[PDB]
Symmetry: C3
Subunit: 274 residues, 3 copies
């Protein structure tokens, strides 16, 4: 199809950007996984049948190619922390697209592509905080991109596209508030700049709260899976059944550690807010 | 006794309110469980012997009957979220009374009846926020009733009547501050209204903090029960002993998930406060 | 050596202070464990060989002797809560020194001695809040010492001396801000006093956040130890292997309960801040 042709062209551009950074192998490592994931995504999409799913994978991969170009720029100039944030966004989009396509959602991959483009804009706003001296605003943008990454990863687990949409609209609203805070910082008026930056911190907290409740909903589902295996264990206390229960117990620990990790970062945002 | 007679009369009023809402079966489902629980409570009380316990179950059941009348009103008018909050309070009082009577506490059921009447007043204040346009104040009242429900449920687990008393005095003090915030909103003076609403949010946080520490005290007791079964396991690594340990491990997970659930809701109150 | 001689003299002073409080047995219980721990520490240090480790154990034990003298003073005068805070600091320094010496760190014991002396200064500032009427400032100092105790205990687990140094510099900066808040409270100017006390609360939160992330790093290491034993269990689902996995699962629960305990106390600091 015509949409499949612009994907091959997008794939060709990705191959060029993958071969462009022959000097840095670490980014080229994740740059090749994006070529592998998209190839798997397109072949998995044509197996599924939905052509709408084939189009939204392209737009997200088109955004991921530009984020890779930011990862190349992040080495020579900008913070090295920005490079890791660019790579974290790349691997997050790769894993989010794969699982969302394996789930067979034509709408979840859409908002994943929508949120990835919005998160790409926030990274661009972070660069204005580097040229125009604003390391504090540079953190807010990196903290916001971090909150979007956690929102996308957990919403793909839930398979809820509405959560990705609501996380993208709050992120896009916060990005324009950082742009207004940058235009403020340029034009003085720090009574407006400080109120805009606290509005952004409020929106970063509003995102991490939705991520915390989503991780809590996953912790409930694992709890029910653990309850049904206990009621199974009371019937047949076998040797292999206990091994499976131990595996599910550790799976619940992984989700609780991530839930305590989000609340640990969300609690620092409140200390910055107040 | 004379006190037992006003309980039968209170039981007759409950039967009438249970039969009044013949149209809605879902509320009638929980309305009949209250008739079953009180009957069990009165028969359990006369088996225990203490007549003071028989009186405080009546006053709480008299309050629960009026909350049911609010649940009937909450369908045709008011928020549907208010109906679920009314039902949540009913099932919470039912389970709190049962466990507190099975524990044999003549003082815990008292403050449970005291806190249930105070929580009923807060629901009444929420209705003033519906007529007098105040959806923000409507949340604060529903958030406050939610904090009282968690405070009563965990304090009945601890069997601590002093915690219920202190949660009821903070809730009654906060309710009068919402009334003052409503009388403020009526008479302008939003410098006083905004300070009264933030005083309420501070008290809602002060309650959820006491609920979080109480759930943490329960998490310690389960930890000691898990330690004593490990030291038992080192003596006899049997097949059935491991099954009991797995059950206690999941019981600790249920308490930790609830503790992370309270802190997740308590953290949103801080975002609203600051 | 000459340094070993001032340790024997310091040990003699500790024996005198241990025998001075013959009336109170509970403090004498922990006072004798300090004599046992230092004796073990000096003998363990001469076995290790490093003479620098022998010197820093003395300075921390010299500070711990003065904290014991505060524990004696805390009975007849001052809050009884201050006595428990003094004992908590003593047992924390005892266990921190022991583990840090068994780990063989000549630099971790240094900053443990540095942080113990800084924490001793904060306790002295708490006494000024008792004479000069300031129970609110008395809590801030006791809350700050509590945050230092948690910071030292978890950093000794990590074996990270840089964390102890950064926790000591924030604690010393906060202590001078409480001194400035006390000199403010004396000389009126509550616009400066209230801003200094909120600066201290911000620094107390900044410490507990570093303690929360450190406890989260320990929770990751236990997670990897639990993953490697699962992959071991898939190879050999034995009887004794499951027992060891159950022990590691409970070890992870102990770390998660402590992590939820720190966040529970850190969340009350935000309610006091905002």
């Amino acid at each position: 199809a015509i949409a499949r042709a612009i994907e091959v062209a997008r794939e060709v551009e990705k191959v060029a950007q993958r071969a462009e950074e022959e000097g840095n192998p670490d980014l080229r490592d994740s740059a090749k996984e994006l070529a592998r994931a998209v190839d798997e995504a397109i072949e998995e999409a044509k197996k599924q049948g939905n052509p709408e799913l084939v189009e939204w994978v392209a737009r997200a991969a088109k955004v991921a190619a530009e984020v890779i170009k930011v990862a190349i720029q992040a080495e020579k100039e900008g913070n090295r922390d920005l490079f890791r944030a660019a790579l974290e966004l790349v691997r997050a989009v790769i894993e989010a697209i794969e699982e969302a396509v394996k789930q067979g959602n034509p709408e979840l991959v859409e908002w994943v592509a929508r949120a990835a483009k919005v998160a790409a804009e926030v990274i661009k706003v972070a660069i204005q905080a580097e040229k125009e001296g604003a390391r504090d605003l540079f953190r807010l943008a990196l903290e916001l991109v971090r909150a979007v990454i956690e929102a996308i990863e957990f919403a793909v687990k839930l398979g809820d596209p509405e959560m990705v949409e609501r996380a993208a609209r709050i992120a896009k609203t916060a990005a324009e508030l950082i742009k207004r805070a940058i235009r403020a910082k340029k034009e003085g008026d720090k009574d407006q700049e400080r109120e805009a930056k606290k509005r952004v911190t409020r929106l970063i907290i509003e995102l991490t709260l939705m991520v915390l409740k989503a991780s809590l909903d996953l912790l409930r589902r694992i709890l029910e899976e653990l309850k049904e295996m206990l009621e199974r264990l009371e019937k047949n206390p076998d040797k292999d059944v206990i091994v499976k229960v131990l595996k599910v117990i550790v799976k619940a620990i992984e989700a609780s550690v991530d839930n305590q990790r989000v609340s640990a970062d969300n609690q620092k945002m409140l200390a910055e807010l107040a």
